[PDB]
């Protein structure tokens, strides 16, 4: 499990400061494919360009991590930004380290990398945490520790899955903030959550106003 959290540039740099650099291969750029288990990533082109400028001066401080796939192709485990950066530089080859990961591990890394890079919307974060917990028979604490997060960051997200559909839909549609949905969790009752949801959208209530209305509803006998 733990090694699936360790393939990104920062963590590879940290391990390499304690030991011999892994063997590097120079793989074809044309033969690289992004992780087939994560959706198409829409990067900030601005940040890919910053990264390309850094590499064109200072080299590629870490090789990407790939597994072998298909006929002589390489699937990214870590390094999609670097791969994108060296295309801007016109490279035909990129330094890489090859790891044998099975599909379940490659799928796990897809979720983990998406969590670490702070990509995901709240419900996406929730679904990713839920799946890593189910796949690996994990504690919320055990997962939070491995992600370098507080147990509450996980729980706040996992609880959004226990909310009713209408509230989840409102959060996904950005009709309410997460902190709105969070406060509605305290009501622990679908009917009250739905009535107060309609109020939030109709009167365009903020977080303070919603939290107050949740306390006043829970203060009732």
């Amino acid at each position: 499990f733990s090694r699936l959290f360790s393939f990104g540039e920062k963590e590879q740099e940290e391990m390499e400061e304690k030991q011999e650099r892994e063997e590097v291969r120079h793989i074809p750029v044309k033969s690289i494919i992004p992780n087939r288990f994560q959706p198409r990533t829409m990067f900030d082109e601005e940040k890919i360009d910053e990264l390309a400028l850094t590499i064109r001066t200072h080299g590629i401080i870490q090789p990407i991590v790939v597994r072998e796939c298909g006929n002589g192709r390489f699937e990214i485990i870590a390094g999609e930004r670097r791969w994108r950066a060296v295309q801007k530089l016109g490279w035909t080859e990129i330094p890489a380290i090859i790891k044998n990961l099975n599909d379940k591990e490659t799928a796990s890394v897809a979720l983990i990398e998406n969590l670490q890079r702070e990509e995901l919307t709240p419900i996406e974060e929730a679904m990713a945490y839920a799946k890593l917990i189910e796949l690996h028979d994990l504690t919320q604490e055990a997962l939070a520790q491995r992600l370098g997060k507080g147990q509450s960051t996980i729980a706040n997200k996992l609880r959004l899955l226990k909310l009713p559909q209408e509230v989840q839909e409102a959060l996904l549609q950005r009709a309410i903030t997460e902190r709105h949905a969070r406060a509605l969790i305290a009501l622990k009752d679908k009917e009250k959550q739905l009535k107060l949801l309609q109020e939030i959208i109709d009167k365009q209530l903020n977080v303070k106003q919603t939290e107050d209305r949740v306390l006043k509803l829970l203060e009732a006998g």
Side-chain angles (χ1 to χ4, degrees), residues 130-140 142-158:
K131 180 58 174 185
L132 291 176
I133 284 163
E134 175 229 81
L135 274 180
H136 295 114
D137 181 12
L138 238 47
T139 298
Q140 298 195 13
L143 174 61
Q145 181 229 258
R146 276 176 236 236
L147 286 167
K149 306 272 133 169
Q151 175 144 30
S152 48
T153 309
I154 304 318
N156 284 348
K157 259 61 196 187
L158 283 179

mmCIF file of all heavy atoms in Angstrom, residues 130-158, unseen atoms left out:
data_model
loop_
_atom_site.group_PDB
_atom_site.id
_atom_site.type_symbol
_atom_site.label_atom_id
_atom_site.label_comp_id
_atom_site.label_asym_id
_atom_site.label_seq_id
_atom_site.Cartn_x
_atom_site.Cartn_y
_atom_site.Cartn_z
ATOM 1 N N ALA A 130 -13.455 7.092 -0.287
ATOM 2 C CA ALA A 130 -14.332 5.924 -0.027
ATOM 3 C C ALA A 130 -13.732 4.696 -0.712
ATOM 4 O O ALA A 130 -13.686 3.647 -0.070
ATOM 5 C CB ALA A 130 -15.748 6.161 -0.483
ATOM 6 N N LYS A 131 -13.270 4.837 -1.953
ATOM 7 C CA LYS A 131 -12.779 3.691 -2.759
ATOM 8 C C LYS A 131 -11.441 3.189 -2.184
ATOM 9 O O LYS A 131 -11.303 1.958 -2.059
ATOM 10 C CB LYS A 131 -12.627 4.070 -4.240
ATOM 11 C CG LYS A 131 -12.130 2.967 -5.157
ATOM 12 C CD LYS A 131 -13.029 1.768 -5.108
ATOM 13 C CE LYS A 131 -12.632 0.729 -6.125
ATOM 14 N NZ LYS A 131 -13.612 -0.378 -6.112
ATOM 15 N N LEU A 132 -10.499 4.083 -1.872
ATOM 16 C CA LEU A 132 -9.194 3.699 -1.263
ATOM 17 C C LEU A 132 -9.442 2.947 0.055
ATOM 18 O O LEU A 132 -8.822 1.870 0.248
ATOM 19 C CB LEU A 132 -8.326 4.943 -1.048
ATOM 20 C CG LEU A 132 -7.822 5.592 -2.328
ATOM 21 C CD1 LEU A 132 -7.077 6.854 -2.001
ATOM 22 C CD2 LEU A 132 -6.930 4.645 -3.121
ATOM 23 N N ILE A 133 -10.350 3.444 0.895
ATOM 24 C CA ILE A 133 -10.738 2.762 2.158
ATOM 25 C C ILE A 133 -11.277 1.363 1.835
ATOM 26 O O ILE A 133 -10.881 0.423 2.544
ATOM 27 C CB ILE A 133 -11.737 3.611 2.958
ATOM 28 C CG1 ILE A 133 -11.020 4.772 3.648
ATOM 29 C CG2 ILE A 133 -12.529 2.759 3.941
ATOM 30 C CD1 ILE A 133 -11.944 5.869 4.117
ATOM 31 N N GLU A 134 -12.145 1.215 0.824
ATOM 32 C CA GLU A 134 -12.813 -0.084 0.528
ATOM 33 C C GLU A 134 -11.773 -1.034 -0.058
ATOM 34 O O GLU A 134 -11.744 -2.165 0.365
ATOM 35 C CB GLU A 134 -14.007 0.090 -0.414
ATOM 36 C CG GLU A 134 -14.674 -1.205 -0.864
ATOM 37 C CD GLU A 134 -14.896 -1.294 -2.372
ATOM 38 O OE1 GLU A 134 -13.916 -1.650 -3.143
ATOM 39 O OE2 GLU A 134 -16.040 -0.998 -2.781
ATOM 40 N N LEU A 135 -10.961 -0.565 -1.003
ATOM 41 C CA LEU A 135 -9.972 -1.382 -1.763
ATOM 42 C C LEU A 135 -8.962 -2.015 -0.804
ATOM 43 O O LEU A 135 -8.551 -3.155 -1.052
ATOM 44 C CB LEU A 135 -9.210 -0.491 -2.756
ATOM 45 C CG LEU A 135 -9.846 -0.276 -4.123
ATOM 46 C CD1 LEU A 135 -8.957 0.635 -4.958
ATOM 47 C CD2 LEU A 135 -10.121 -1.609 -4.831
ATOM 48 N N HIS A 136 -8.546 -1.264 0.212
ATOM 49 C CA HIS A 136 -7.355 -1.570 1.041
ATOM 50 C C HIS A 136 -7.749 -1.916 2.485
ATOM 51 O O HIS A 136 -6.838 -2.162 3.274
ATOM 52 C CB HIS A 136 -6.383 -0.397 0.918
ATOM 53 C CG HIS A 136 -5.859 -0.243 -0.468
ATOM 54 N ND1 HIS A 136 -6.155 0.861 -1.244
ATOM 55 C CD2 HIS A 136 -5.078 -1.048 -1.224
ATOM 56 C CE1 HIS A 136 -5.545 0.749 -2.411
ATOM 57 N NE2 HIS A 136 -4.883 -0.420 -2.426
ATOM 58 N N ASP A 137 -9.052 -1.991 2.792
ATOM 59 C CA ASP A 137 -9.595 -2.284 4.146
ATOM 60 C C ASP A 137 -8.849 -1.388 5.142
ATOM 61 O O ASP A 137 -7.995 -1.888 5.881
ATOM 62 C CB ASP A 137 -9.515 -3.777 4.493
ATOM 63 C CG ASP A 137 -10.084 -4.095 5.872
ATOM 64 O OD1 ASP A 137 -10.739 -3.201 6.466
ATOM 65 O OD2 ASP A 137 -9.848 -5.217 6.360
ATOM 66 N N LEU A 138 -9.167 -0.097 5.129
ATOM 67 C CA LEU A 138 -8.349 0.982 5.725
ATOM 68 C C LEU A 138 -9.198 1.720 6.752
ATOM 69 O O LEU A 138 -10.437 1.761 6.620
ATOM 70 C CB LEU A 138 -7.894 1.928 4.610
ATOM 71 C CG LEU A 138 -6.389 2.134 4.442
ATOM 72 C CD1 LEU A 138 -5.646 0.808 4.459
ATOM 73 C CD2 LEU A 138 -6.083 2.881 3.146
ATOM 74 N N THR A 139 -8.530 2.234 7.775
ATOM 75 C CA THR A 139 -9.073 3.242 8.708
ATOM 76 C C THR A 139 -9.046 4.595 7.992
ATOM 77 O O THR A 139 -8.119 4.807 7.173
ATOM 78 C CB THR A 139 -8.266 3.222 10.010
ATOM 79 O OG1 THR A 139 -8.436 1.916 10.559
ATOM 80 C CG2 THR A 139 -8.694 4.275 11.006
ATOM 81 N N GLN A 140 -10.020 5.457 8.292
ATOM 82 C CA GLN A 140 -9.988 6.899 7.952
ATOM 83 C C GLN A 140 -8.639 7.474 8.408
ATOM 84 O O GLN A 140 -7.999 8.165 7.603
ATOM 85 C CB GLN A 140 -11.171 7.637 8.586
ATOM 86 C CG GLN A 140 -12.536 7.151 8.112
ATOM 87 C CD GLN A 140 -13.666 8.103 8.446
ATOM 88 O OE1 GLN A 140 -13.454 9.253 8.821
ATOM 89 N NE2 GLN A 140 -14.893 7.631 8.304
ATOM 90 N N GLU A 141 -8.227 7.189 9.652
ATOM 91 C CA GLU A 141 -6.931 7.638 10.235
ATOM 92 C C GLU A 141 -5.788 7.067 9.382
ATOM 93 O O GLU A 141 -4.917 7.856 8.959
ATOM 94 C CB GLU A 141 -6.798 7.252 11.714
ATOM 95 N N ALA A 142 -5.798 5.760 9.115
ATOM 96 C CA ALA A 142 -4.749 5.085 8.316
ATOM 97 C C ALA A 142 -4.621 5.788 6.948
ATOM 98 O O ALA A 142 -3.475 6.096 6.536
ATOM 99 C CB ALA A 142 -5.052 3.608 8.200
ATOM 100 N N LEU A 143 -5.743 6.095 6.281
ATOM 101 C CA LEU A 143 -5.722 6.779 4.958
ATOM 102 C C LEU A 143 -5.211 8.214 5.129
ATOM 103 O O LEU A 143 -4.337 8.624 4.356
ATOM 104 C CB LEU A 143 -7.114 6.765 4.319
ATOM 105 C CG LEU A 143 -7.253 7.573 3.023
ATOM 106 C CD1 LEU A 143 -6.323 7.050 1.944
ATOM 107 C CD2 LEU A 143 -8.690 7.553 2.528
ATOM 108 N N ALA A 144 -5.745 8.951 6.099
ATOM 109 C CA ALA A 144 -5.369 10.360 6.371
ATOM 110 C C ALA A 144 -3.855 10.435 6.628
ATOM 111 O O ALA A 144 -3.210 11.347 6.088
ATOM 112 C CB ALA A 144 -6.168 10.910 7.534
ATOM 113 N N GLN A 145 -3.312 9.511 7.421
ATOM 114 C CA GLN A 145 -1.868 9.478 7.768
ATOM 115 C C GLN A 145 -1.094 9.350 6.452
ATOM 116 O O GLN A 145 -0.272 10.224 6.167
ATOM 117 C CB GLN A 145 -1.589 8.358 8.781
ATOM 118 C CG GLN A 145 -0.141 8.250 9.234
ATOM 119 C CD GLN A 145 0.355 6.825 9.150
ATOM 120 O OE1 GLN A 145 0.447 6.125 10.159
ATOM 121 N NE2 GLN A 145 0.666 6.378 7.938
ATOM 122 N N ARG A 146 -1.414 8.345 5.641
ATOM 123 C CA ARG A 146 -0.700 8.058 4.369
ATOM 124 C C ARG A 146 -0.797 9.249 3.395
ATOM 125 O O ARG A 146 0.131 9.422 2.618
ATOM 126 C CB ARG A 146 -1.197 6.733 3.786
ATOM 127 C CG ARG A 146 -0.482 5.527 4.386
ATOM 128 C CD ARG A 146 -1.004 4.176 3.925
ATOM 129 N NE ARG A 146 -1.408 3.345 5.060
ATOM 130 C CZ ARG A 146 -0.968 2.122 5.351
ATOM 131 N NH1 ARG A 146 -0.080 1.509 4.584
ATOM 132 N NH2 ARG A 146 -1.446 1.507 6.419
ATOM 133 N N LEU A 147 -1.843 10.078 3.464
ATOM 134 C CA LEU A 147 -2.018 11.277 2.586
ATOM 135 C C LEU A 147 -1.440 12.539 3.237
ATOM 136 O O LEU A 147 -1.519 13.603 2.603
ATOM 137 C CB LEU A 147 -3.507 11.477 2.281
ATOM 138 C CG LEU A 147 -4.111 10.481 1.287
ATOM 139 C CD1 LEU A 147 -5.619 10.571 1.294
ATOM 140 C CD2 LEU A 147 -3.570 10.708 -0.112
ATOM 141 N N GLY A 148 -0.895 12.437 4.452
ATOM 142 C CA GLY A 148 -0.463 13.590 5.269
ATOM 143 C C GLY A 148 -1.589 14.595 5.469
ATOM 144 O O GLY A 148 -1.364 15.789 5.206
ATOM 145 N N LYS A 149 -2.763 14.126 5.906
ATOM 146 C CA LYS A 149 -3.975 14.949 6.175
ATOM 147 C C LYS A 149 -4.487 14.657 7.592
ATOM 148 O O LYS A 149 -4.101 13.628 8.174
ATOM 149 C CB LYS A 149 -5.074 14.643 5.150
ATOM 150 C CG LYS A 149 -4.678 14.775 3.682
ATOM 151 C CD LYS A 149 -4.865 16.175 3.112
ATOM 152 C CE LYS A 149 -3.660 16.661 2.331
ATOM 153 N NZ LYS A 149 -3.957 17.898 1.574
ATOM 154 N N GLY A 150 -5.328 15.539 8.130
ATOM 155 C CA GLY A 150 -6.083 15.294 9.371
ATOM 156 C C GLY A 150 -7.240 14.345 9.120
ATOM 157 O O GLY A 150 -7.819 14.386 8.006
ATOM 158 N N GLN A 151 -7.571 13.515 10.114
ATOM 159 C CA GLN A 151 -8.721 12.574 10.073
ATOM 160 C C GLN A 151 -10.022 13.340 9.746
ATOM 161 O O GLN A 151 -10.939 12.727 9.156
ATOM 162 C CB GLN A 151 -8.805 11.808 11.399
ATOM 163 C CG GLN A 151 -10.022 10.887 11.519
ATOM 164 C CD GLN A 151 -9.734 9.601 12.271
ATOM 165 O OE1 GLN A 151 -8.881 9.549 13.158
ATOM 166 N NE2 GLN A 151 -10.458 8.544 11.929
ATOM 167 N N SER A 152 -10.113 14.626 10.096
ATOM 168 C CA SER A 152 -11.347 15.441 9.917
ATOM 169 C C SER A 152 -11.511 15.852 8.445
ATOM 170 O O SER A 152 -12.674 15.939 7.971
ATOM 171 C CB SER A 152 -11.386 16.641 10.852
ATOM 172 O OG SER A 152 -10.158 17.348 10.826
ATOM 173 N N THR A 153 -10.395 16.085 7.744
ATOM 174 C CA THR A 153 -10.377 16.426 6.299
ATOM 175 C C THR A 153 -11.045 15.278 5.528
ATOM 176 O O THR A 153 -11.857 15.578 4.624
ATOM 177 C CB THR A 153 -8.953 16.704 5.804
ATOM 178 O OG1 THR A 153 -8.330 17.646 6.677
ATOM 179 C CG2 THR A 153 -8.932 17.255 4.395
ATOM 180 N N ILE A 154 -10.734 14.028 5.905
ATOM 181 C CA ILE A 154 -11.299 12.793 5.298
ATOM 182 C C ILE A 154 -12.788 12.731 5.639
ATOM 183 O O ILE A 154 -13.618 12.603 4.699
ATOM 184 C CB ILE A 154 -10.571 11.530 5.796
ATOM 185 C CG1 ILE A 154 -9.053 11.563 5.571
ATOM 186 C CG2 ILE A 154 -11.181 10.276 5.195
ATOM 187 C CD1 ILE A 154 -8.602 12.098 4.242
ATOM 188 N N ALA A 155 -13.112 12.782 6.936
ATOM 189 C CA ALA A 155 -14.480 12.590 7.469
ATOM 190 C C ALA A 155 -15.421 13.639 6.874
ATOM 191 O O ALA A 155 -16.506 13.254 6.402
ATOM 192 C CB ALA A 155 -14.465 12.634 8.975
ATOM 193 N N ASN A 156 -15.000 14.902 6.859
ATOM 194 C CA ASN A 156 -15.787 16.020 6.268
ATOM 195 C C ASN A 156 -16.220 15.621 4.849
ATOM 196 O O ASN A 156 -17.399 15.865 4.481
ATOM 197 C CB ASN A 156 -15.003 17.340 6.249
ATOM 198 C CG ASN A 156 -14.916 18.030 7.596
ATOM 199 O OD1 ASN A 156 -15.618 17.663 8.535
ATOM 200 N ND2 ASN A 156 -14.061 19.037 7.696
ATOM 201 N N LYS A 157 -15.305 15.010 4.085
ATOM 202 C CA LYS A 157 -15.558 14.570 2.691
ATOM 203 C C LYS A 157 -16.428 13.318 2.717
ATOM 204 O O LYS A 157 -17.428 13.304 2.001
ATOM 205 C CB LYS A 157 -14.253 14.344 1.920
ATOM 206 C CG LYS A 157 -13.869 15.470 0.974
ATOM 207 C CD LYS A 157 -13.639 16.784 1.664
ATOM 208 C CE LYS A 157 -13.629 17.975 0.737
ATOM 209 N NZ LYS A 157 -13.227 19.185 1.493
ATOM 210 N N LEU A 158 -16.056 12.289 3.470
ATOM 211 C CA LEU A 158 -16.802 10.999 3.413
ATOM 212 C C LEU A 158 -18.272 11.250 3.773
ATOM 213 O O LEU A 158 -19.143 10.560 3.199
ATOM 214 C CB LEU A 158 -16.184 9.959 4.349
ATOM 215 C CG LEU A 158 -14.909 9.285 3.857
ATOM 216 C CD1 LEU A 158 -14.399 8.312 4.906
ATOM 217 C CD2 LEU A 158 -15.119 8.562 2.522
#
